[PDB]
Structure formats: C-alpha cells, structure tokens
Amino acid sequence: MLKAGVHFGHQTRYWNPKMKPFIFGARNKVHIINLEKTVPMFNEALAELNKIASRKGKILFVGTKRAASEAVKDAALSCDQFFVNHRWLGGMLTNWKTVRQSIKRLKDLETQSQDGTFDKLTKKEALMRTRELEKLENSLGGIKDMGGLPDALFVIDADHEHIAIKEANNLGIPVFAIVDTNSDPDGVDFVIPGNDDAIRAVTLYLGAVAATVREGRS
Amino acid sequence: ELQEKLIAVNRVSKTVKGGRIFSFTALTVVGDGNGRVGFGYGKAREVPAAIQKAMEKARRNMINVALNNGTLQHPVKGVHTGSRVFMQPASEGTGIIAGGAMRAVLEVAGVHNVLAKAYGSTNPINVVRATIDGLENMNSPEMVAAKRGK
Amino acid sequence: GQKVHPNGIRLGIVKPWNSTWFANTKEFADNLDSDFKVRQYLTKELAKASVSRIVIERPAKSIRVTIHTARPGIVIGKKGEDVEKLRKVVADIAGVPAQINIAEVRKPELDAKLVADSITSQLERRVMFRRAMKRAVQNAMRLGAKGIKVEVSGRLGGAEIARTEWYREGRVPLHTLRADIDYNTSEAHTTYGVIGVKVWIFKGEI
RNA sequence: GGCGUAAAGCGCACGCAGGCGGUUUGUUAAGUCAGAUGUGAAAUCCCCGGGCUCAACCUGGGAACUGCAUCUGAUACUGGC
RNA sequence: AGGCGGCCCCCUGGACGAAGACUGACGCUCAGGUGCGAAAGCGUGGGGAGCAAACAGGAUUAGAUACCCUGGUAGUCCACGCCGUAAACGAUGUCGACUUGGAGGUUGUGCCCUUGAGGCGUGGCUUCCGGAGCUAACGCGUUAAGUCGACCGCCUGGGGA
RNA sequence: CUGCAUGGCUGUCGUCAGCUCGUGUUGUGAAAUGUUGGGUUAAGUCCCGCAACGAGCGCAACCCUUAUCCUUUGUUGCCAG
RNA sequence: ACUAUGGUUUUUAUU
C-alpha cells in the first residue's frame, strides 16, 4: 500500500453518526480518523485486486464525475483495463442476456457507413440510423469488447454513482470504493478511508491501482 | 441422478367473449431421488404448450434437501400466503407416511419417510412455493466447532 | 387472418402461373367450356408422373403443356429426349394433336405441395400425424426457408373429437403484398369424417 | 382462532372481590421434581404368547390409567415469612 | 372521553428535570358497582330581531310533495328537573417494556472567550421527515398496526337482529 | 322449411396507427413494464428520458398518375422556318 | 323551467 492520502484536516460535521466506520474524535471543529483499525483493510483493498489480476479477472473502472472522466481515459492509455466515463443503464449487467443485443447493434453500426446504400441522394438523410451509434458508444461503448461480465468494479467516490453499484452488487460482483468523511458507503464490498479532493482521489489513487493490474502473469 | 413428474393441470377461468379463453396452466417437478428437487409453473394456449413452459422452468432450478439417518436433518417451516407448510422426519424403514399430493414431490426427492402438514391452502401451484421456502429454511452446519449436531 | 389466399387473391403479382390459353375474342366465352375438358383425365395422371407443377399452354385451336418433375424416369424412362410415350396420351384425352414439354426440379422437398402430400398420408389413414409435421418442419428449415406453417383440421381425436392445430416455426408474413409464400390446399372426406391440411412456406421477399 | 377495515375494543375514567408484580441472603417445603409403598377391576389401542378345530369365551404377562393418599428426600424456580 | 373559544375574572385536581436525598413494593388491571349530556325531545315557567322542522301563497311540472320565491310555528337564547344517547369517528383498550437517525416547536437542565451580526449535549411532551419490520391491500413506522408481556371486555355465515 | 349445424363470402370504422413477440423486471395473483412519460406528425413518425431492451406485422417505402422543359417517332396527325 | 320505465327464457369451437 502507497498514498492514498487520507487527511487534511478540513470541514465540520458532514459525517454519518450511525455508522461511524473510521472517525474516533474531534479537535477545533475538525474530525480525526483512526488509521490503526484500517491496517487489515489497507492490506486487503489492493492485495485482493492483485489476487484477481493474477487470475485474469476482468476489471471495470468507473469515473463519470467531470473531475475524473478524462484521467480514467489516460489511465486506460497506460493499462489494458476496461473503463467507463459516460452513462449507465438499468440492466447494464443484470439484463446482459437481453442487453447484449444492443452491443451486437453497436458493432453493426461501426461498419454501416461503408454500405453502398449509404452513398445515395442526400448526405444528411443517409446518416439518420447510423447516428444511433453515438448513444450506444455512450452507454455500452466501455463494455462491448469485454465479451461477458466483469470480475470486479472499481470506483473512487462512495455516493456519486448509483446504477453502476446496483448492476454489480446484485449480480455478486464485488465493488471497491474509497470513503471521505463527507460520504457513507452503500452496495460496496471493499471499503477503506480516502479523500474527496481530485488531487488525491484521481491524481494519486487511480495511478496506484493500475500499478497493481499490470502485474499479472496468470 | 434424474427423476421427472407431472402434478397438476388447469384451464384458465376467463369468459373472454361469448366463449372462454384457450389458455391452460401446468405444474411439473424434477429431482434426483437422492437429495435434490426443482419445480416449474407455466401458462400458454392448450396443455401441450403449457406443460412444456412448466418443464422448461423446472429444468432451470435445483435445491438440496438436508438429510440425516435417511430422513430430514430437522423439522422445518416453509410459507407462501395460505400455504403454511410444516415438514417433519419419520421412523426407520417407512414410506406411508407419505400420500396425497405430497407423495408426488417426495417421490422425485427420493424420501417417503417424511411427514407434512399444510395448515391452510393445499392448492398445488401455491403449496409447492411454501415447501421450497422450507428447503431454503433447511440448516447445514457450518457450526460443529461450537454447537452439537450434525 | 386467415382467408387472404397466397395462390388466390395474392396470385396476381410476382408469381409464375399454372395455366394460359388463347382464343378468338368473340368466342372466349364459348371456349371457357373447354377449361375442365382438358383437366378431367389429366389431373389424375400428374402424381403418376411425380409432377410438382404443371403449366397448361394452349395456342389458338391447339395444346402444348409443360410439366415440372424430379422423377421423369417414372413416365418416360431413359434418356429423356423422346417424349412420345406421354404425347400419345395427352393428344388422345384432349381430342386434338399435342406437343408436350418436360422440365427439371430444384429442392423438391422445399415445396408446400410435397409437405401437404406428406401430411395428408397420415390423416387419410387415421394414424399418428404429428411425427410427419415435425419431420416436415425440420426438413424444410434445414433445406432452405425462414419460416413455415403446417396446419391440420378435423378427426384429430381422441375418438370422435374434431379439433385443429399447427405449431409454427420461424417467421411467415401472410399479409405483406410481395412476400412470395409457397402454398397448397388439401381437403378430404373418409366417408366417416372431414379433414383439411393447410401449408405456407416463407423463403424471401420480392 | 380473531377485534383499523370484511365479524368483534364497553362513551370514558375510577374501583370492591378475583387476576398479575423488581432484587439478594436467611427460613418454610405449599407448588415443582426425585427414591419407594398402596391403587387405577374387566377392558381401551399396542408388544409378545397360551386352553379348545380357527375364533368367541378364557388367558398371562408387558405397555398403561401420567391421578389420589402416606413414607423418605432435593431447594434452583414460584409462593409464604 | 364525550366535550370546550366574543371579551374580562375568582375557587380547585393534574405534570417533571438537574445536583441529590428519604420511604421501602406502597406497583398495574378489573365481573357487577361508581358518575355526567353535545344537539334535538319531555316537564315547568320566561322571551322573539334574523334563521327555520311543521304550515300557508304563486310558479316550475305529467305531478312538485323539492329547487325558485313571499310569508312562518316549534326550536335556536335562559334556568331547575326528567331523557340518559350518537360516527361519544382521529373506525385505534388500559398499563409495563425493547429498538435507529435528521431538523424545528414546547418545557426542564448543563456546557463552549457564544465570540458570528451563535451553537452543542440531554430528560418530559410534540410537528414534519425518516432505516428495519408488520399487512389481503390501503395503512401503522420508536407518540408504530414493529417487538414481547400483565388485565379486562367482545365475536362465530347473508337477512331475521 | 330454417343461418341457435357446418363451409364459403361477408357490414363499417379506414390507410385508421394500431395490434403483438422473446428474455429480463415487478406483485399473493389476475395483471403491470416496454407500447407509459416529455416535444413533434399524417403516424407506435422522430428526438428526449429510461429497469427494461431490441424486434415482428400494420405504417413509411414500393407501385400508378399530373402541369413544365426535354426526348424517341413524322402517320391519312401538326405547320414555326 | 321537466319525468318514471325494461317480466321470464336467452345461441360460435366445427361438416
């Protein structure tokens, strides 16, 4: 384990009281976190990711928030891992035995503008059906090459996404997330402390996880 | 390894015109005669279609029965609406014991040394949902490092 | 559905016809009386030549005909370039000299008339018929086609019950104009009950 | 076995008789249970065997009537103090 | 509890918290009993502007017994008795107990230069939200119809009742 | 004789935009979802939005037909030069 | 500104 920044400190109470998984105290209206109760979890969050990467588990990285949606695309330039930075749909994994027909439509439209029937009359009218491709490239474009289901889902926010969590968690796929003291986890299988500032969530940790995926072998 | 059986068939009630609808409903079961069971309900026009939708549902699910001394590993409750089923173990070298419609499910699970009470609806398409709520309520320990039995 | 007829109300477009006859415009109404006189002794000779389709050709005060058969050896033997043995019959039943022609057949089991004859053989005999229906579907769909209807009505018991059934496969557009659906009607009475067999095959549009 | 509704919560509160009531150490042994004696005939349903051809009828012991009284004990729990 | 507000008044039951203390089971529920009235009704005496069961007049209409529209009795106000009753409907029984959180109201009790031209703990009560669960479904959600207990009353098909 | 038997053909809405499918989803279930919702049209037509998605038949296409300017022909039809 | 009626019986799934 390597940074992974976890404290500033900053802000007053935006924490869940129920349900206080990492906070243990307050000083000068800033709340402090216990990093000794989390050693068994820091030695797990990327250690288990390495275990499935060493077993050729297919990994899906999520970042639809505009602070992460481009850094996750440079992370896919430096690693042969799956990424989504645009929208999700209800049934995107939990209806795959039907929704794979939209993937098979996506790949058929990537070749449709080379048809001899596409050259006829008006350029504007010939493209009206092939324009549906840009909506499938926005919802299934990140999973069309996967040929099946992910082995794990990785997110760097604990409450920005919802359908990306519902589609994985119900289907028995483990979700991995980092939690700031301004968020509370739901539908997550692997949890650890982190920060909400993009310079820590995006710029540090989204590099540190790709350094765990490039290790397999097996 | 594999046992198959037909339990019930019924025409859909609806007066649709004038005449009645030609839809039918069927209930079938699958098992192994050794410790597993699966069930299927189906609805389609005429019995030769409705029975096949039921078989294709019954060929898509399988649950294990918890067994000890050749009978149930414990007495168990299983409920679906008016079907408030209780299933309990019987004596050595026994099979009647089982009769009526419960015999048709125990015949594909393989164990007639099991006694049942419905405490309400014996309606075949609904009581079959309460028995498998009982098979999901069967205990397999996963506790023998602290608690007695097995 | 179900009365839109592929070889009736939909026959006036894109399909080959089985009869054409020429006459004086002032006596077509008089020559109309002959259209059964050319069939009455010939219709029961078509199966005896294994014919899949007939084309009646009748020039002014003349007769020709063309017949399509997979098994011409049943009616002409070897080698097929002398049709005398059939011409001498066709000219005698017609009461006028004739010149008949014989044509070849491609995929003969992919035909609504053969499927209908293969199913009628079971019901005119009061035997098990569903085996022949499933065999015809798994014959046609593996020889060509994209969907098929094979339907039966009457004496489907169960003793003295009548009933009707089909069980469809693939897709079959019966209301689309230029669908080119291959079809045949079959109807019979055993002197103990009425039976009917209905067949439609879809291969491709236009 | 139920009482918002399909059938049932008193118009409501107070209260005599009845029902119910925190906790520990003594003490009692009513209630509870334990070691035995006495009895519940003939039978019941059941387990094994007998006098008569089978069977009735008659058996000859089990299993059993889980209560009621007396004797000798236990004191956790419930009740008395 | 049913019930109770034009305004202004006196007599009298009841609740509970913080720092603590004393008494010593004195705590809960009840067969039959105990006690009283909203609006009309009855008795026995007053009063009358407006409204108005009943009642009178013309339309409207087949008729109008209702609406329209002109008049109007009892009653409505007031008191001592009798009536003792309904949706006395927030369709929910009285008491004891265990649950997970947000913000305000109300009523007590603590803390923090209050440091902001403000807040956080925590009992009795409460308005809106709100995580499990309960249900035939709509509903009930710690002031639950969740979860477990003490006591009393009631009920066995339609209508007859 | 009879359209309360059995075929066949059948009125009108109306070329109207509607009727349906498979696999998922949801309820105790008949049933619902999609096809509803938001703009638009002649329109289940097209975008938007989306636990439902893509599809089938109907549609739109396809087919026939018209004013103008051309074009083949050149007649017993026509006559600008 | 305007109103009340309808007894009893009651048919497709196949020659």
Q: Are C38 and C56 in contact (CB under 8 A)?
A: yes
Please, is C173 exposed, middle or buried when counting C-beta atoms within 10 Å of its C-beta (0-12, 13-18, 19+)?
Answer: middle
Torsion of Cα atoms, C113 then C114 then C117 then C119, to 10°: -110
Q: Which nucleotides in chain F have some atom under 7 angstroms from a protein Cβ? A: 8-10, 22-25, 28, 30-31, 46-48, 50-58, 61-62
**CA of residue C67 to C1' of nucleotide F2, angstroms:** 48
What type of residue sits at position A48? Answer: E
Q: Which nucleotides in chain G have some atom under 7 angstroms from a protein Cβ? A: 12-15
DSSP labels, chain C: -----TTTTT-SSSSPPSEEE---TTTHHHHGGGTTTTTTTTGGGSGGGTEEEEEEEE-TT-B--EEEES-GGGTT-SSSS--HHHHHHHHHHHTS-B--EEE--SSTTS-HHHHHHHHHHHHTTTS--HHHHHHHHHHHHHHS-SEEEEEEES--SSTT---EE---EE---SSSTT---EEEEEEEE-SS-EEEEEEEEE----
Tell me the C-alpha to C-alpha distance, in Å, between residue C169 and each of B55, C166, C202. Answer: 20, 10, 11
Task: Give chain B as a 3 state SS string.
Answer: CCEEEEEEEEECCCECCCCECCEEEEEEEEECCCCEEEEEEEEEECHHHHHHHHHHHHCCCCEECCEECCEECCCEEEEECCEEEEEEECCCCCCCCCCCCHHHHHHHHCCCCEEEECCCCCCHHHHHHHHHHHHHCCCCCCCCCCCCCC
Cα(A184)–Cα(B103) distance, integer angstroms: 52
Q: Which of C2, C1, C62, C6 is nearest to C177 (CA)?
A: C6
Cα(C136)–Cα(C130) distance, integer angstroms: 10
Cα(A151)–Cα(A93) distance, integer angstroms: 12
Cα(A85)–Cα(A66) distance, integer angstroms: 9
**CA of residue B130 to C1' of nucleotide E152, angstroms:** 39
Cα(B71)–Cα(C52) distance, integer angstroms: 67
Please, is B1 exposed, middle or buried when counting C-beta atoms within 10 Å of its C-beta (0-12, 13-18, 19+)?
Answer: exposed
Q: Contacts for C89-94 with beta carbons within 8 Å, 24 or more apart?
A: C89/C45, C90/C42, C90/C63, C90/C65, C91/C63, C93/C41, C93/C42, C94/C38, C94/C63
B150 touches strand G (CB under 7 A): no
Please, is A12 exposed, middle or buried when counting C-beta atoms within 10 Å of its C-beta (0-12, 13-18, 19+)?
Answer: exposed
Rounded to 5, what percent of chain A is helix, strand, coil? 35, 15, 55
* Elucidation method: cryo-EM
Q: Are B34 and B61 in contact (CB under 8 A)?
A: no
**Chain B: partners with 3+ C-beta pairs within 8 Å:** none
What type of residue sits at position A176? Answer: F
Q: Contacts for C81-87 with beta carbons within 8 Å, 24 or more apart?
A: C86/C49
Rg (CA), chain B: 17
Beta bridge partners of B43: B25
Element (H, E) at A31: strand A30-33
Helix axis angle, C130-143 to C112-123, nearest 10°: 170
Angle of CA points A68, A70, A71, to nearest 5°: 65
Phi-psi region of C191 (alpha: psi -120 to 50; beta: other; left: phi over 0): left
Q: Are C159 and C186 in contact (CB under 8 A)?
A: no
Cα(A49)–Cα(C201) distance, integer angstroms: 56
Closest nucleotide C1' to the C-alpha of A105 = F54
Q: Which of A88, A68, A23, A45 is nearest to A176 (CA)?
A: A45
Cα(C180)–Cα(C60) distance, integer angstroms: 31
Please, is A43 exposed, middle or buried when counting C-beta atoms within 10 Å of its C-beta (0-12, 13-18, 19+)?
Answer: exposed
A133-148 burial by CB neighbour count: b if 16+ within 10 A, else e? Answer: beebeebbbbbbeeee
**CA of residue A178 to C1' of nucleotide D52, angstroms:** 96
Tokens of A91: 């049934």
Q: Which nucleotides in chain E have some atom under 7 angstroms from a protein Cβ? A: 100-102, 136
In residues, how long is chain C?
206
- Which residue's entry shows tokens 């897709």? C171
DSSP labels, A147-166: -S--SEEEES-SSS-SHHHH
Q: Is the dihedral of CA B134, B135, B137, B139 positive or negative?
A: positive
**CA of residue A116 to C1' of nucleotide F39, angstroms:** 34
SS3 A44: helix
Q: Are A160 and A68 in contact (CB under 8 A)?
A: no
Element (H, E) at A177: strand A175-179
- Residues touching nucleic chain E (CB < 7 Å): A 17-18; B 81
Q: In what order do the strands lie in the sheet with C51-58?
A: C19-21, C51-58, C66-69, C101-103
Closest nucleotide C1' to the C-alpha of A17 = E101
DSSP code for A22: S
Q: Are A212 and A53 in contact (CB under 8 A)?
A: yes
Cα(A1)–Cα(A45) distance, integer angstroms: 9
Rounded to a whole number of angstroms, the distance between the first and last alpha carbons of chain B is 25
**CA of residue C37 to C1' of nucleotide E46, angstroms:** 123
Tokens of A137: 């490239």
Q: Are A144 and A107 in contact (CB under 8 A)?
A: yes
- Which residue's entry shows tokens 């002409």? C76
A155-174 burial by CB neighbour count: b if 16+ within 10 A, else e? Answer: bbbbeebeebbbbbbeeebb
Closest nucleotide C1' to the C-alpha of B18 = G12
Tokens of B124: 């075949």
Cis amide linkage into residue B130, ω under 30° from 0 = no
Antiparallel, parallel or unpaired: β B67-68 and B63-64: unpaired
- Residues touching nucleic chain F (CB < 7 Å): A 87-91, 94-95, 97-99, 101-102, 105, 128-129, 131-132, 135, 163; B 14, 43, 81, 126; C 3, 5, 171, 173, 175-178
SS3 A42: helix
SS3 A25: strand
Cα(A114)–Cα(A117) distance, integer angstroms: 9
Tokens of B92: 């050595």
Sorted by sequence, the CB contacts under 8 Å of residue B117 that are 6+ apart come out as: B85, B86
SS3 A62: strand
What type of residue sits at position A6? Answer: V
Tell me how far the alpha carbon of residue C99 is from its chain's centroid. Answer: 23
Cα(B121)–Cα(C163) distance, integer angstroms: 36
SS3 A60: strand
